[PDB]
Amino acid sequence: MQGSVTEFLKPRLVDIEQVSSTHAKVTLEPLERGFGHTLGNALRAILLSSMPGCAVTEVEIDGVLHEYSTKEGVQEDILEILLNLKGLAVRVQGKDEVILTLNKSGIGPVTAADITHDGDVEIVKPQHVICHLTDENASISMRIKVQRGRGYVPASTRIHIGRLLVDACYSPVERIAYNVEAARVEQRTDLDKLVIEMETNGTIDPEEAIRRAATILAEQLEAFVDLR
Amino acid sequence: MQGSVTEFLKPRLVDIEQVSSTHAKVTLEPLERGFGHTLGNALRAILLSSMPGCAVTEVEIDGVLHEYSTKEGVQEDILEILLNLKGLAVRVQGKDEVILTLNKSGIGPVTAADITHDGDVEIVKPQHVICHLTDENASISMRIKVQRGRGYVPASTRIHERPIGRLLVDACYSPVERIAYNVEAARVEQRTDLDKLVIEMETNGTIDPEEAIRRAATILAEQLEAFVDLR
Amino acid sequence: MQGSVTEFLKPRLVDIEQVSSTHAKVTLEPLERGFGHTLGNALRAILLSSMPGCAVTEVEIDGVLHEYSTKEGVQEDILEILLNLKGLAVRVQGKDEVILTLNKSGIGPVTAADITHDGDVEIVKPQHVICHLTDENASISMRIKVQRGRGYVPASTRIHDERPIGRLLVDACYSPVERIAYNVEAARVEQRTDLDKLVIEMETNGTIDPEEAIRRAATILAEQLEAFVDLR
Amino acid sequence: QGSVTEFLKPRLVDIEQVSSTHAKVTLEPLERGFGHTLGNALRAILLSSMPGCAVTEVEIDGVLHEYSTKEGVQEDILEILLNLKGLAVRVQGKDEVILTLNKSGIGPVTAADITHDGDVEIVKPQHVICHLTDENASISMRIKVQRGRGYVPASTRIERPIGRLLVDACYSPVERIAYNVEAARVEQRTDLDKLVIEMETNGTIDPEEAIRRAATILAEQLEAFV
């Protein structure tokens, strides 16, 4: 090449290792010394708190008046059910609120697969157990409210009829970790590669989780443009 | 939620408090919770290591063959002069290298103000003493090389050249010297959650506080180009 | 149900076991005897041939004229590159044709991660090697055409034209389903004893999710039957 | 997937009744490979999931056990139950209908002698159930016809005894199925087939409705994936 004063060498998503359906290892590579931790800490903060996502916020179970109520033909208590509903990982098309209906009579587990198939709704882990009906004459009929939000708004902060409130885990990102490691490139010798380890709820893809973290970051800096 | 700026309020340079000529307190305000430290740490890392800046790298003094003493008519030894030249804070237009000539005969201090006025070269502290000529028949004539760079770069360079440069001085190209930040709850009255990031800067004068920030942000934003939109 | 016309248990996606990023095991459960193989064979046929998906159809490499010509500074021959481009797994937003540009100068592998970042495009396996530049003065600049199609249409089945000169044709593997297998297994239900559970083993190219691959197979099936299920 | 109409959907294009209980239905616009896909799907539904009414119980006056024979009837009670098994009846919208058969005279007591019920349609009225020998002979029975699936034997059911008799239920409205894919010569394109489904029914079901019910069972199984 030809120049006089170098000041670039930007990283790019170079590899994706899906350890599982909800755990991956993304690696941004050309990283000038010190930039591993700079982007690593910036992103880890965005991923761990500013990611969008859908989450169950309310549930209306038939016969259940309040949380400390009773469901004779159900193994776990209503509280345990709301705790089960919190882990309902759902990916919805574009709406910011969708009502899910769950009708189930029988002996055995009432899983997320028993939820009424809505075309515009995606159930990440259908094998996710929400209930366990004990007797063969037992049944549950509930309307699970799923909303689009950010972060973690628990039941407390509110201003509210069997409307059962459930702690909202809106964030598609469950656990972020990063390592800087020497990306021993043939060319130079001082370059690193940032390895971002993700543990999502499935509702978000690793690469899109990164491209949204970067977008939140870059947009915060919009008022400090200065080209070059 | 749609395109270009969502729910997230964005920060902007809201105030600049120059504690002195080289120490200031910049404050970016509308900051959603958690963004104070996110930008604060991102920027503090860019400011503390990726800032450009000019620095004296070589000096050619007439009569002086090498860094070890003997200069007839000058108070301080050549080494002390090179150490003095290191502190020469210069802000240049757009040359990654400019040669400054300093001719001076006369009793008293040879300051940075005596350097030959180059149009594009801006001398931050003209009262910066480089020398002290003892007798009245004493004089120095040197060509000070000023280069653009980043970070510290020791006198270690080369191994074995029409144009030369006899004496070498350790280059501390960084303009930014020390960074500190505080998040503090902002004051807007309406939403009273919001924070304001206060970035405390101690520069070498060759760089303005706001431009130091807008360059830090630009290095950050450009690193993210493969995950955002630009490029 | 009340007057009764049904008298039959309907299966539903009950579990998804992602053996890996591109291999999963989907299981539809309440299945009346004989229905495991009936749906299993129906679906396996739809999945194995009627699935949509994105695929590289054309490529325009700078300096390369014919598909059987040389290249300065690249390890593998142009044919090998087109074969490499076939395995480019890309997931695009909403578009039946997107042009991807790949500019790369240097030494080492030119992977899918080097493709110019389009917002519209999603590159499934960025570590996918497309090239290997031998000398440092070596470089490739190509425009890879990615189209939305169905199943697999070989180069042969594109023998006419448009701009034959330069545009190198590549075999299109539109379907994101590389291999399907199914097992019926007794779903040893709590009370019943005639019920099975259909286990569909999938080996996709990543561009398609297991459950959506099934819900698209079922949709192709159900829609074929539209003239015998309603139409009135 | 963007989805929405790209494949050539087939439709019932012709019906060739080789006889009263044997037909050849043909669904035509069929993209390559879809002949066998639908052909095998349907053939499995037709061969095992079809409804159909069947005689399950019979209450003959004077008769108690199957070991009885009757005063005035040619064939023994067992033979009569075996005759009742072949009673092909098509009922409106019910899962159980009681048929009454009163008959005095000499000659065959056929399905045509069964008391005309509005809902009940008797497919083969000339179907012989009995043969009364003397002219003072007569039978009076209530034949129970139920809706169900597949072949459900009498052993799946069995003061002391109730009224009487049980008969092996052959609910399946269809006996045998066969299909051929054959290239269609549709005057549009050329890489298309036509599925020919050969049916041998018991008469209680029409060919086209047998297909439209097979397709409906199929499509409804896929409801959770559509």
Mutation site for B-interface testing, chosen from A221, A222, A225, A227 by largest number of B Cβ within 10 Å? A221
The partner residue sitting opposite C18, judged by closest CB among A12, A20, A106, is: A20
d(CA D37, CA D40): 6
Structure tokens at B121: 């070269």
Say yes or no for a CB contact (<8 Å) between A217 and B217.
Answer: no
**Strand partners for A99:** A145
Could you tell me where the beta strands, DSSP code E, fall in D41-191? 53-60, 89-90, 96-104, 107-110, 121-122, 128-132, 138-147, 151-152, 169-170, 174-180
d(CA A169, CA A152): 5
String of DSSP letters for A89-138: -EEESS-SEEEEEEEEESSEEEEGGGS---TTEEES-TT-EEEEE-STT-
Contact A166, A59 (CB under 8 A): yes
**C14 three-state secondary structure:** strand
d(CA B90, CA B205): 8
d(CA A138, CA A105): 6
Instruction: Enumerate the domain spans of chain B.
Output: 1-52+174-227, 53-173
* Cα–Cα nearest to C123, from C172, C87, C152: C87
Contact C133, C139 (CB under 8 A): yes
Structure tokens at C121: 């495009």
Structure tokens at D131: 């043969």
Q: What is the residue type of C89?
A: A
Q: For the purposes of burial, counting CB atoms within 10 Å of the CB of C94, is it exposed (0-12), middle (13-18) or buried (19 or more)?
A: exposed
* Cα–Cα nearest to B203, from B94, B64, B53, B55: B53
Say yes or no for a CB contact (<8 Å) between A10 and B225.
Answer: yes
**D218 three-state secondary structure:** helix
Q: Which residues in chain A touch residue C117, judged by CB atoms under 8 angstroms apart?
A: 12
d(CA B45, CA A33): 11
For B1-52+174-227, give the CATH class. Answer: alpha beta
User: Beta strand D96-104 with B108-111: parallel, antiparallel or unpaired?
Assistant: unpaired
Q: What's the first-to-final CA gap in chain D, in angstroms? A: 13
Is some CB atom of chain D closer than 8 A to the CB atom of A160? no
Smallest CA–CA distance from B225 into chain C, residue: C117
Q: Which residues in chain C touch residue A10, judged by CB atoms under 8 angstroms apart?
A: none
Mutation site for D-interface testing, chosen from A102, A115, A117 by largest number of D Cβ within 10 Å? A117
Is some CB atom of chain B closer than 8 A to the CB atom of A28? yes
Structure tokens at A79: 């509280």
Q: Which residues in chain C touch residue A186, judged by CB atoms under 8 angstroms apart?
A: 107-108
**A82 three-state secondary structure:** helix
Q: Which residues in chain D touch residue A117, judged by CB atoms under 8 angstroms apart?
A: 223-225
How far is C-alpha C88 from the chain's CA centre?
10
For B143, residues 6+ apart whose C-beta sits below 8 A from its C-beta are B59, B60, B99, B100, B101, B102
Q: Which residues in chain C touch residue B231, judged by CB atoms under 8 angstroms apart?
A: 116-117
Asked how this structure was determined, the answer is X-ray
**C104 three-state secondary structure:** strand
d(CA C116, CA C97): 16
Contact B207, B91 (CB under 8 A): yes
* Cα–Cα nearest to B42, from A198, A37, A219: A37
Could you tell me where the beta strands, DSSP code E, fall in A22-77? 23-31, 54-61
- HEC sequence for B93-146: CCCCEEEEEEEEECCEEEEHHHCCCCCCEEECCCCCEEEEECCCCCEEEEEEEE
d(CA D173, CA A86): 49
Structure tokens at D125: 């009225």
Contact D197, D211 (CB under 8 A): yes
The partner residue sitting opposite C52, judged by closest CB among D1, D49, D224, is: D1
The set of chains that have 3 or more CB pairs under 8 A with A is B, C, D
Structure tokens at C4: 């009764």
**B4 three-state secondary structure:** coil
Q: What's the first-to-final CA gap in chain B, in angstroms? A: 22
User: Beta strand A129-133 with A108-111: parallel, antiparallel or unpaired?
Assistant: antiparallel
Is some CB atom of chain A closer than 8 A to the CB atom of C190? yes
DSSP code for C11: P
CB < 8 Å from A in window 52-91 of B = 52
- HEC sequence for C61-85: ECCCCCCCCCCCCECCCHHHHHHHH
Q: What is the residue type of B49?
A: S
For B53-173, give the CATH class. Answer: mainly beta
Give the H/E segment covering residue D17.
strand D12-17
**Strand partners for C109:** C132
d(CA C26, CA C12): 10
Contact B112, B102 (CB under 8 A): no
**C231 three-state secondary structure:** coil
Smallest CA–CA distance from B51 into chain A, residue: A7
Contact A125, A202 (CB under 8 A): yes
> Is chain D adjacent to chain B, meaning 3+ CB pairs within 8 angstroms?
no
Give the H/E segment covering residue C47.
helix C35-47
* Cα–Cα nearest to D174, from D83, D13, D10, D43: D43
For D15, residues 6+ apart whose C-beta sits below 8 A from its C-beta are D23, D24, D25, D26, D207, D208
The partner residue sitting opposite B223, judged by closest CB among A11, A13, A49, is: A11
Contact D35, D184 (CB under 8 A): no
> How many other C-beta atoms are found inside a 10 Å radius of the C-beta of residue A23?
16
Is some CB atom of chain B closer than 8 A to the CB atom of A214? yes
Q: Which residues in chain D touch residue A119, judged by CB atoms under 8 angstroms apart?
A: 226
Is some CB atom of chain D closer than 8 A to the CB atom of A120? no
The partner residue sitting opposite B10, judged by closest CB among A45, A49, A220, is: A220
Contact C211, C18 (CB under 8 A): no
Q: May I ask the CATH architecture of the domain A2-52+171-224? A: 2-Layer Sandwich (3.30)
Q: What is the resolution of this structure in A?
A: 2.5
Smallest CA–CA distance from A114 into chain D, residue: D224
Alpha helices in chain B (DSSP H): 35-47, 78-86, 209-223
Alpha helices in chain A (DSSP H): 35-47, 78-86, 206-220
Chain C nearest C-alpha distance from D61 (Å): 32
Mutation site for C-interface testing, chosen from A26, A125, A127, A208 by largest number of C Cβ within 10 Å? A127
The partner residue sitting opposite B10, judged by closest CB among A38, A45, A219, is: A219
Q: Which residues in chain A touch residue B213, judged by CB atoms under 8 angstroms apart?
A: 224
The set of chains that have 3 or more CB pairs under 8 A with C is A, B, D
Say yes or no for a CB contact (<8 Å) between C39 and D95.
Answer: no
Q: CA B34, B39, B45, B48: dihedral to nearest 10 degrees?
A: -120
Say yes or no for a CB contact (<8 Å) between B150 and A8.
Answer: no
Contact C48, C177 (CB under 8 A): yes
d(CA C217, CA C201): 14
* Cα–Cα nearest to D66, from D154, D144, D170: D154
Q: Between helices A206-220 and B35-47, what is the axis angle to 10°?
A: 80
Domains D1-51+172-226 and D52-171 share a fold: no
* Cα–Cα nearest to D121, from D202, D182, D60, D65: D202
String of DSSP letters for B52-73: --EEEEEEEETT--SSSS--TT
**B69 three-state secondary structure:** coil
CATH 2.170.120.12 corresponds to the domain C53-174: yes
Structure tokens at B81: 């002069």
Mutation site for C-interface testing, chosen from A2, A9, A18 by largest number of C Cβ within 10 Å? A18
Say yes or no for a CB contact (<8 Å) between C191 and A13.
Answer: no
**Of 3.30.1360.10, 3.40.50.2000, 3.40.50.1860, 1.10.10.60, which CATH number belongs to D1-51+172-226?**
3.30.1360.10
Q: Which residues in chain B touch residue A8, judged by CB atoms under 8 angstroms apart?
A: 222
Could you tell me where the beta strands, DSSP code E, fall in D61-208? 89-90, 96-104, 107-110, 121-122, 128-132, 138-147, 151-152, 169-170, 174-180, 192-201
d(CA C175, CA C148): 9
d(CA A205, CA B49): 33
d(CA B78, CA C136): 45
C2-52+175-228 folds as Gyrase A; domain 2 (3.30.1360)
Is some CB atom of chain A closer than 8 A to the CB atom of B148? yes
The partner residue sitting opposite A127, judged by closest CB among C15, C106, C117, is: C15
- Enumerate long-range contacts of B152-158, CB under 8 Å, 24 or more apart: B153/B57
Structure tokens at A125: 């882990």
Say yes or no for a CB contact (<8 Å) between A18 and C15.
Answer: no
Contact A24, A17 (CB under 8 A): yes
Is some CB atom of chain C closer than 8 A to the CB atom of A16? yes
d(CA A195, CA A27): 4
Smallest CA–CA distance from D224 into chain A, residue: A117
HSE toward the beta carbon, residue D116, CA cutoff 13 A: 1
Chain D nearest C-alpha distance from C104 (Å): 32
Contact D199, D23 (CB under 8 A): yes
Chain B nearest C-alpha distance from A214 (Å): 6
Mutation site for B-interface testing, chosen from C101, C117, C121 by largest number of B Cβ within 10 Å? C117
d(CA D216, CA D222): 10
Say yes or no for a CB contact (<8 Å) between B217 and A226.
Answer: yes
d(CA D82, CA D61): 18
**B84 three-state secondary structure:** helix
DSSP code for C10: P
Q: Which residues in chain C touch residue A208, judged by CB atoms under 8 angstroms apart?
A: 122
Is some CB atom of chain C closer than 8 A to the CB atom of A111? yes
For C48, residues 6+ apart whose C-beta sits below 8 A from its C-beta are C175, C177, C180
Q: Which residue has the tokens 């991923």?
A: A47
Contact A12, A26 (CB under 8 A): no
**Of 3.40.50.2000, 2.170.120.12, 3.40.630.10, 3.30.565.10, which CATH number belongs to A53-170?**
2.170.120.12
Is some CB atom of chain C closer than 8 A to the CB atom of D136? no
- Note the CATH number of domain D52-171: 2.170.120.12
Q: CA B3, B9, B14, B17: dihedral to nearest 10 degrees?
A: -120
Helices (H) and strands (E) in chain A, counts: 3, 12
* Cα–Cα nearest to B226, from C93, A192, A8, C61: A8
User: Beta strand D151-152 with D169-170: parallel, antiparallel or unpaired?
Assistant: antiparallel
